[PDB]
Amino acid sequence: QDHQKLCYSALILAMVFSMGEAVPYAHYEHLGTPFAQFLLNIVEDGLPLDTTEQLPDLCVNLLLALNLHLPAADQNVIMAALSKHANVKIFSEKLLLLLNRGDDPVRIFKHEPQPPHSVLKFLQDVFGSPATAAIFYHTDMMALIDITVRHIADLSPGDKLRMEYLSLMHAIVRTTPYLQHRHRLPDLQAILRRILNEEETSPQCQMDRMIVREMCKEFLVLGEAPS
Amino acid sequence: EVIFADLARRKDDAQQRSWALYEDEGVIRCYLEELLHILTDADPEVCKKMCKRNEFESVLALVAYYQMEHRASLRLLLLKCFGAMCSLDAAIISTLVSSVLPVELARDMQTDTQDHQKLCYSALILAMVFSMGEAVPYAHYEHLGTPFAQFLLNIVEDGLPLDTTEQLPDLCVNLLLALNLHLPAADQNVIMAALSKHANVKIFSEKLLLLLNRGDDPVRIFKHEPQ
Amino acid sequence: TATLRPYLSAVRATLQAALCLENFSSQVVERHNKPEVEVRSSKELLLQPVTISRNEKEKVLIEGSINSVRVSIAVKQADEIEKILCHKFMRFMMMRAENFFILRRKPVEGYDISFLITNFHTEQMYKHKLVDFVIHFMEEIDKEISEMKLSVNARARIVAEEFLKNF
Amino acid sequence: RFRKVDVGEDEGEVDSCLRQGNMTAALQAALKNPPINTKSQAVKDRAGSIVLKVLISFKANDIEKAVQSLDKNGVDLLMKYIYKGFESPSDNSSAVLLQWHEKALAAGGVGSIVRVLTARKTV
Amino acid sequence: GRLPACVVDCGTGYTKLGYAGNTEPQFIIPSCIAIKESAKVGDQAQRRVMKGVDDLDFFIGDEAIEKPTYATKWPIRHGIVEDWDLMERFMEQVIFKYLRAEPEDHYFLLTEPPLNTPENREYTAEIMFESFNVPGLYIAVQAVLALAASWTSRQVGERTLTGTVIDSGDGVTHVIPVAEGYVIGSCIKHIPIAGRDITYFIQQLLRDREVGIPPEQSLETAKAVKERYSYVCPDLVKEFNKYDTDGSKWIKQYTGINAISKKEFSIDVGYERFLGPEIFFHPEFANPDFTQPISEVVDEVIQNCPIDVRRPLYKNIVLSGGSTMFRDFGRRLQRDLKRTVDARLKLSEELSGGRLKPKPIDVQVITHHMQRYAVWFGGSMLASTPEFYQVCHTKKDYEEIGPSICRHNPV
Amino acid sequence: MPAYHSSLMDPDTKLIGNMALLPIRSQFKGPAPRETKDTDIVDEAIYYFKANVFFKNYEIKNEADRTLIYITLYISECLKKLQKCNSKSQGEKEMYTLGITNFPIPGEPGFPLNAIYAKPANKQEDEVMRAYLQQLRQETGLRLCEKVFDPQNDKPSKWWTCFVKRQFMNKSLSGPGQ
Amino acid sequence: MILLEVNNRIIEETLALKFENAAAGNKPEAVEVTFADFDGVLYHISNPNGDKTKVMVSISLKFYKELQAHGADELLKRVYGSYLVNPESGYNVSLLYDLENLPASKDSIVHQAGMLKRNCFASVFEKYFQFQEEGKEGENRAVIHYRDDETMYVESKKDRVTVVFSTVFKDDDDVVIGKVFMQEFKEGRRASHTAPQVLFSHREPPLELKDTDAAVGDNIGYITFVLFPRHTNASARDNTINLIHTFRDYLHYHIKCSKAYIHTRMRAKTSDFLKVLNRAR
Amino acid sequence: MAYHSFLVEPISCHAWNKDRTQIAICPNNHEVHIYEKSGNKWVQVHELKEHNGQVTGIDWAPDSNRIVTCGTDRNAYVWTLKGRTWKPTLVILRINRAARCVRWAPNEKKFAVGSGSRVISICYFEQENDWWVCKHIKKPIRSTVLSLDWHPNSVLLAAGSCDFKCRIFSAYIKEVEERPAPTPWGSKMPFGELMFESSSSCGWVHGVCFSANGSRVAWVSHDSTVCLADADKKMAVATLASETLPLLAVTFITESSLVAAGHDCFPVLFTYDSAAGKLSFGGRVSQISVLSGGKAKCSQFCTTGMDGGMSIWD
Numbered sequence A: 001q002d003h004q005k006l007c008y009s010a011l012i013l014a015m016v017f018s019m020g021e022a023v024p025y026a027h028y029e030h031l032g033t034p035f036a037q038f039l040l041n042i043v044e045d046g047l048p049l050d051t052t053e054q055l056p057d058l059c060v061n062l063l064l065a066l067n068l069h070l071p072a073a074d075q076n077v078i079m080a081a082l083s084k085h086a087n088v089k090i091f092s093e094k095l096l097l098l099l100n101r102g103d104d105p106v107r108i109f110k111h112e113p114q115p116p117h118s119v120l121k122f123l124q125d126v127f128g129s130p131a132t133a134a135i136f137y138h139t140d141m142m143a144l145i146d147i148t149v150r151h152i153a154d155l156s157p158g159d160k161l162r163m164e165y166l167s168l169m170h171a172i173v174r175t176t177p178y179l180q181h182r183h184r185l186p187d188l189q190a191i192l193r194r195i196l197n198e199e200e201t202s203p204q205c206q207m208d209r210m211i212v213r214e215m216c217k218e219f220l221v222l223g224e225a226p227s
Numbered sequence B: 001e002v003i004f005a006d007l008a009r010r011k012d013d014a015q016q017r018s019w020a021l022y023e024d025e026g027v028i029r030c031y032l033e034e035l036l037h038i039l040t041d042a043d044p045e046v047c048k049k050m051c052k053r054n055e056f057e058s059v060l061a062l063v064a065y066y067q068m069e070h071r072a073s074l075r076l077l078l079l080k081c082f083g084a085m086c087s088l089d090a091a092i093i094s095t096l097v098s099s100v101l102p103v104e105l106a107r108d109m110q111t112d113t114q115d116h117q118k119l120c121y122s123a124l125i126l127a128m129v130f131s132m133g134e135a136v137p138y139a140h141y142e143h144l145g146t147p148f149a150q151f152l153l154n155i156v157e158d159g160l161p162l163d164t165t166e167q168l169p170d171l172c173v174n175l176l177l178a179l180n181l182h183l184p185a186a187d188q189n190v191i192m193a194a195l196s197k198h199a200n201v202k203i204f205s206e207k208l209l210l211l212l213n214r215g216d217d218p219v220r221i222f223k224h225e226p227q
Numbered sequence C: 001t002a003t004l005r006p007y008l009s010a011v012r013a014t015l016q017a018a019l020c021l022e023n024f025s026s027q028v029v030e031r032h033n034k035p036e037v038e039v040r041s042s043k044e045l046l047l048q049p050v051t052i053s054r055n056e057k058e059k060v061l062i063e064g065s066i067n068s069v070r071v072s073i074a075v076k077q078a079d080e081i082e083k084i085l086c087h088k089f090m091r092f093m094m095m096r097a098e099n100f101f102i103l104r105r106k107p108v109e110g111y112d113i114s115f116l117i118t119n120f121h122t123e124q125m126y127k128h129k130l131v132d133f134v135i136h137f138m139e140e141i142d143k144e145i146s147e148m149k150l151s152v153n154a155r156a157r158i159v160a161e162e163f164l165k166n167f
Numbered sequence D: 001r002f003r004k005v006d007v008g009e010d011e012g013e014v015d016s017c018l019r020q021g022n023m024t025a026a027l028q029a030a031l032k033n034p035p036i037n038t039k040s041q042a043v044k045d046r047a048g049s050i051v052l053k054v055l056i057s058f059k060a061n062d063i064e065k066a067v068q069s070l071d072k073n074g075v076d077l078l079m080k081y082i083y084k085g086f087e088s089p090s091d092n093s094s095a096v097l098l099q100w101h102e103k104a105l106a107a108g109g110v111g112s113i114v115r116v117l118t119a120r121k122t123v
Numbered sequence E: 001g002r003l004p005a006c007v008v009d010c011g012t013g014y015t016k017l018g019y020a021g022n023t024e025p026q027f028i029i030p031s032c033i034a035i036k037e038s039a040k041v042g043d044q045a046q047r048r049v050m051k052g053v054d055d056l057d058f059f060i061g062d063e064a065i066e067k068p069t070y071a072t073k074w075p076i077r078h079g080i081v082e083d084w085d086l087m088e089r090f091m092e093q094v095i096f097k098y099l100r101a102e103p104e105d106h107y108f109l110l111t112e113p114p115l116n117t118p119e120n121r122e123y124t125a126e127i128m129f130e131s132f133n134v135p136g137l138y139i140a141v142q143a144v145l146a147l148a149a150s151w152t153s154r155q156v157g158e159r160t161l162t163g164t165v166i167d168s169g170d171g172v173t174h175v176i177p178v179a180e181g182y183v184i185g186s187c188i189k190h191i192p193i194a195g196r197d198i199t200y201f202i203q204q205l206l207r208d209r210e211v212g213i214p215p216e217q218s219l220e221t222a223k224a225v226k227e228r229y230s231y232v233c234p235d236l237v238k239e240f241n242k243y244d245t246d247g248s249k250w251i252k253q254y255t256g257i258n259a260i261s262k263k264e265f266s267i268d269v270g271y272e273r274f275l276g277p278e279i280f281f282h283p284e285f286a287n288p289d290f291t292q293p294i295s296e297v298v299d300e301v302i303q304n305c306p307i308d309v310r311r312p313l314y315k316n317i318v319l320s321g322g323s324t325m326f327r328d329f330g331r332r333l334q335r336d337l338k339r340t341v342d343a344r345l346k347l348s349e350e351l352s353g354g355r356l357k358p359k360p361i362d363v364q365v366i367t368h369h370m371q372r373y374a375v376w377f378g379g380s381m382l383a384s385t386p387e388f389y390q391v392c393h394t395k396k397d398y399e400e401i402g403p404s405i406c407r408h409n410p411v
Numbered sequence F: 001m002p003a004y005h006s007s008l009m010d011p012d013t014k015l016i017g018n019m020a021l022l023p024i025r026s027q028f029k030g031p032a033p034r035e036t037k038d039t040d041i042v043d044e045a046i047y048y049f050k051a052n053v054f055f056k057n058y059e060i061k062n063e064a065d066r067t068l069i070y071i072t073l074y075i076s077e078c079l080k081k082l083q084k085c086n087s088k089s090q091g092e093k094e095m096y097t098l099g100i101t102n103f104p105i106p107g108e109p110g111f112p113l114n115a116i117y118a119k120p121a122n123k124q125e126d127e128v129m130r131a132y133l134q135q136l137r138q139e140t141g142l143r144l145c146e147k148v149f150d151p152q153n154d155k156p157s158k159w160w161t162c163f164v165k166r167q168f169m170n171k172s173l174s175g176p177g178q
Numbered sequence G: 001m002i003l004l005e006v007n008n009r010i011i012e013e014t015l016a017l018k019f020e021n022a023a024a025g026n027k028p029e030a031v032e033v034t035f036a037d038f039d040g041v042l043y044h045i046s047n048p049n050g051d052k053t054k055v056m057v058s059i060s061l062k063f064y065k066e067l068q069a070h071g072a073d074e075l076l077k078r079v080y081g082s083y084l085v086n087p088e089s090g091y092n093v094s095l096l097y098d099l100e101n102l103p104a105s106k107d108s109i110v111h112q113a114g115m116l117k118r119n120c121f122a123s124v125f126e127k128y129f130q131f132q133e134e135g136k137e138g139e140n141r142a143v144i145h146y147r148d149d150e151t152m153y154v155e156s157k158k159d160r161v162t163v164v165f166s167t168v169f170k171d172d173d174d175v176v177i178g179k180v181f182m183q184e185f186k187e188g189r190r191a192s193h194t195a196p197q198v199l200f201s202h203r204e205p206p207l208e209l210k211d212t213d214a215a216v217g218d219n220i221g222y223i224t225f226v227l228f229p230r231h232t233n234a235s236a237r238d239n240t241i242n243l244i245h246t247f248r249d250y251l252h253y254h255i256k257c258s259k260a261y262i263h264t265r266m267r268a269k270t271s272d273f274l275k276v277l278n279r280a281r
Numbered sequence H: 001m002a003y004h005s006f007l008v009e010p011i012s013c014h015a016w017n018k019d020r021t022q023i024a025i026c027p028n029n030h031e032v033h034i035y036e037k038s039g040n041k042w043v044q045v046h047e048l049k050e051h052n053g054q055v056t057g058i059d060w061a062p063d064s065n066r067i068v069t070c071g072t073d074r075n076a077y078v079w080t081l082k083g084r085t086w087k088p089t090l091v092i093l094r095i096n097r098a099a100r101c102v103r104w105a106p107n108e109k110k111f112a113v114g115s116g117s118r119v120i121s122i123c124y125f126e127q128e129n130d131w132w133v134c135k136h137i138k139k140p141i142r143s144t145v146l147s148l149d150w151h152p153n154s155v156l157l158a159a160g161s162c163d164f165k166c167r168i169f170s171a172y173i174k175e176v177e178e179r180p181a182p183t184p185w186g187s188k189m190p191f192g193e194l195m196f197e198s199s200s201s202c203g204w205v206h207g208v209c210f211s212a213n214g215s216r217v218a219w220v221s222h223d224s225t226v227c228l229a230d231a232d233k234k235m236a237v238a239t240l241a242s243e244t245l246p247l248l249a250v251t252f253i254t255e256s257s258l259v260a261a262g263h264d265c266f267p268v269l270f271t272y273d274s275a276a277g278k279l280s281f282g283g284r285v286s287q288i289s290v291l292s293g294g295k296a297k298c299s300q301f302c303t304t305g306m307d308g309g310m311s312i313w314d
């Protein structure tokens, strides 16, 4: 009933978790799934007092920060909420508008030992299981594959983030019905050709080439010759 | 110079002021709140010199805009500007008293009792301008006289359900004391007719003696020379 | 295929060489002053066209002249829906060419947008910020189209809901 | 109607050095024969295709040594061939020519590009 | 069977809607649009940004003029469409909600003000051909339709195909000479005064004189006293003296109802009975930079027309549009003109020694009951004719040539 | 265009500076002769005033226009005082004290129309036009004071005081230098 | 407006005005007006034979032959009764009121008059709903040419009444955008669990309809609604009939608006680009 | 860098008074402004405003104190200080397209105007008419003439052009001038004979200059190249291509060194040696001129540009 206190409460939790450190296990009595389900409802239809329409943005920011410290997708107290929520229309959309720009809302501060890029992290944690891979509407996931197939191409060698989009394609390929619709598969292969041949020699470039070798070994349709 | 130029150039935009099309609240708000700061952070003698520039055109244009504007947000900032201007110089006060501004404030208060914040500031600015005891146009008494005096007496006796600070009782005492200050003679005095006709005034009576007991004069709010 | 950083850097270094414009009254009419790249009426004042491309679909053509340079660029319409949305975005940007002083009111044939810089623009405007605008356009255009695709998908879903829920 | 009246108007050496692996010299071998004077068109398309084979078949890490081996004449010729390959896009070709561009630019500067634009006898 | 074409007259004050072949428009609606204003909480930094289906939450016409939670916008200004975003929405609800015509099979007759910039014709055709999907469009000159409305309504035997039409909408006044059905476009003159300027001048003059009208209703009362109490006066300085001396009869009380408190309020109505429409004869009042009376401009238009047509024009000055409806308007315009033309002749007697006396000129100023919707009626009669479907731009033309087919105009 | 212009420029009537010393039908002392016709230049100004203030361009025909315009500028100033007056008696006493104040004369600084009036060069020009303009002011104020106050209550009437805001082509005889 | 409203404003306005003056009694002023609606409907309101006291409304549905095969006649009589006079010449239905006898229930008679197009269509649905609600299944299938190249197929099945709208998209923009909207209709049950199943077949007839001369081509689309007993029953049939017969124009209406909505955003995105170039000045 | 922004807009030409007390400039319009060095700060002293269209070249005759101006209006005017106000004299220039450059001859008896009409007008005074009259160099000039410089003998004229080629012409006006001495460029020099042609074929030739001995011409081209033709090597020409943007103007400062400037907005020195016959980039906008010491041994030189203002260098 206090819209101002709610906004600051959400903002401070996002500020507090923004460095991704592990919490006392005692916290998850509250910070567990029931609170995650509460945050999804705030984004999906909001509150009558939110005449600024401002809580949905703060709560999207908060779920990204909350997940930032969890180690995996199977135990993940947030992803178990998304699985059980009746229908995640609005959250699905807002997450893509952030990925499209590719910025990280959770890095609100300049502290130097920075955590992973929160949205790339959150999506890799979504796709780690078939139950949460169904979050997306068909048109949304088509736009997702398009957005990531673009970002993987445009990022120059040696960027930390190019590995993350490679990992997110690996996740999408491995757990969605991808090879039965193949939406951008010609363009993906044409990029994976270039990435695998890339003669740059930095450690991150070696890691990018390795994850392509993992990805094509798992799915031989990748790396096949152009049509 | 820039602000008083642009405010004039909006005031006379006779198309936009009656058949609105452009969005203009934001730019006006920024110009008004910038004005309010300069009138209080800057050298008073510069601020005087721009108000009194061409027979107070900068002042009178801004007054004419207040009669014409009806966004309550913008009205409230204009009042704050008029107070700061009124503080600068008795020559500005006597201009404001002689212009239309007092009549619109009294008409506004009698009709729009709901904006408590504008209502308080309205009574403040109205008491400020009358504080010098300058003679008004007789046309002003038409609104300012006995009907308006009864309206103030009702507020100070009965209050309004929306006033939780009780500022209106005190401000309405000061406003009646300000309006009376300039009236000559005795019997025809428009305020005295209201006191005579009002049904059992009593809270005003005992509030008035508490002023006399201390002997202060709430109306002398400014240090201007001819006391 | 090729990454975006080399492609923009090659374009920048090229376009930086072409903006060495000069004032030049024409030879063909008494004392008219007109951009030679558009009038093309004498051909010893036209520079060799040069092209930079990062794949078979995204290409930047630079057409220099002693007093003007025309820059015309093509962007990848990867989807059927993007062709419509890109055309509309260019149309509404091109509909305002008097504000974008360096913009043509029609594209060059086979390009999606086309800028025309005169000597006067390099004399009045910051020359280096004109390059940065061409580059800033070229960076952002496909992010902007992607945003439109998402926003149309969202509207279609809400409109579908508002019908079915009444049954 | 008055108003409308119109009025008042080497390859056998290039592939030899390539197959020997003398790649740095294989760049030189291509640049010996500029068909600048040629009236023929197909000769130009041939010469551009031959040099493109060397630019593509070069290893990417060795482009620095290759360009640095050229003289300022060779660098201006190299640029004139680089900007030609961009007009025949192909899946790999654009990625390498954009790299050859950056290293030819570091050698020749923007002035080398101006001599592409001002070149009156189009190669 | 064959469905009647749609006629839409996008006035600066009132849009007029209906189908061809009707003696009246089916709707007269104020050309305004009410949009949801709550975005102003965010829109302090930049203009309101739309998402979802929020841009379908709007009302137009009488549904929009007094809604408690929507900001009314007025898209049209000097007859020109000034904000195409709002006008494009206004068209959607006009077509689908009011007319309920599927655009795909109805031709549209869509009117134009003679001052309309070519760029604005490109946009209006682009919206009608490409945002909608009209099968054919015709941008029609308002003045010719107004003359034909009088031609087809007035008595037989006096149906002259030539006249000077004065059209004073809410935005601008146009004086258009027509001979043998051809618009003499070179000779057109525009007077930058109309109903809005009369309204604003009354609105200012009340706010000087008569504080007590609440600002929200300042426009409402200025409009009401204009339409009900104002008249064109015979002589200004003498009228002030009449009002000063016989004020008991000339001053009229108006009583208004407060929009919020629903208390009544009342005002004297005074000099702004004859001031107001006087600005037609003294434009310097409302407009700083125009000074020729209407009775001066009309003569300059006629006396530029070919010598043969000048006499026919004076016989058939047609008044059109709602701002010409003031009582005694035409009577004074005639008197001023007659005093101007008969002196022009009298001079040419003396410069000829009286050897010949010229025939007089019979200045006549004519008025007809369609004047609130005369342009629309003239359109609905045009759109009934088979020639209309031959004159329209067909959709295939906009496929072969772009918006450029609508660059041209009568001038 | 045509605002009202002075009718009474008789060729017999002498000039000072660029202003015509038309006779005045006044009991106040002053150098111009005593008028006897019903109309008078002060009454031209007072009769035209309500109409004349609305026009925004004014073409000087002769010195009498430079004279009559001065009256209207002064009427647009006296209305400021008498709108505050509670009674006709107050206004009449007030107005007498207004007009005797030393208003600027042509070319003396702060005078609003230095482009259009030339300064009198000599004492017999200067003192006489001061003695003329003074009696014009004295009479002009009194003639308003007879007709602006409604006789039923000495209310300075709404219909006259309405004009106080409407300065004659934005020119003030108060002068913009203050 | 998100949904298209069902009642024609010109009837609703003019009859309400005329019946108001009848209640005031002041004057039987003449009326003669013609106007279209959607579906190529062509109404006419007139005084019959010049009797200014009588008012007659007429409909002119082009497809009324082979719609009155499915009732569309007894229904009009059941709903209008004494008001359903003989057809005016050239028109299939007429409906005559008079200012002398009209009841005090003015609002009911005027509102029901506005529904005249709906009350013509409603009989095909009401018939086939009553078949499904009574378990017949072998009956013939209703084909209704609600536009001249665009046909509705209403078919009864023991579990279902299905409504196939063939439709045609005139510009490639409308095909590309329309194909988006119906993808969101396909999944639309995910946010509305009770809603009818909507199927979209694009160029090709749906395989059960593939026993009639249904068209094929890039501009053609088939949309199939499935109406369950929760919709066709006697409590819900009236609202369901109101929705269904407007769907085709609902879809085309929102295609128009969505193009306009894009234009709003493009002007904004352009303005934020211009703001960059202004820093080069 | 001594600097002063006279204008924001392009200073389209400048010329210097005899003792450098005054500077004449175009403020990017059809007027010429003269400024006097009023102590540390410049003050405008005259405004020559007879032209009907933008002035494109100014020159100031140091011995005779006369200012000649030409413009895209196809006028030229010779301005003489009549008492206190500059008054123009007509030039019967007879060109059908814009003028582009003007230079007084070292003897100030004649001047030359280059133009878009593909000619060089050589002007001299015709005292019976009190106007200036022209003879046209014409035959090999295929396009517009961009810049001019005179040999110190006031007969040989070097011209750069849009048809990529620098050339030397013999502008011997037999009507006003005694026959010149033989030179290393040649012994023949009747009016309009062609003494030299550049080897170049690509870039436009923006700037041309003579050495103070007249034995060397240097030019600069849109190729970002400098060249120097030396008459004592029998017209062998050095070349140096460079990595930066083009050079717009050039001057000798000694017989063995040049200064140039270009779209890079800073001045650049090019030295030369008569042994090998090569230019060398000694390194470091619209035109350059020498303030003091002349082309033989300059001590100060100055520059103006499209970026606005004046700059002086040592």
Ligand SMILES: Nc1ncnc2c1ncn2[C@@H]1O[C@H](COP(=O)(O)OP(=O)(O)O)[C@@H](O)[C@H]1O
Binding pocket: E010, E011, E012, E013, E014, E015, E168, E169, E170, E171, E195, E196, E223, E226, E227, E228, E321, E322, E323, E324, E325, E326, E372
């Ligand atoms: N009886 C009347 N007298 C004077 N003006 C009127 C009267 N009735 C309407 N008007 C005015 O007519 C003006 C123009 O209306 P209209 O002719 O519909 O304008 P447009 O057609 O250009 O939109 C409006 O300002 C309206 O106030």
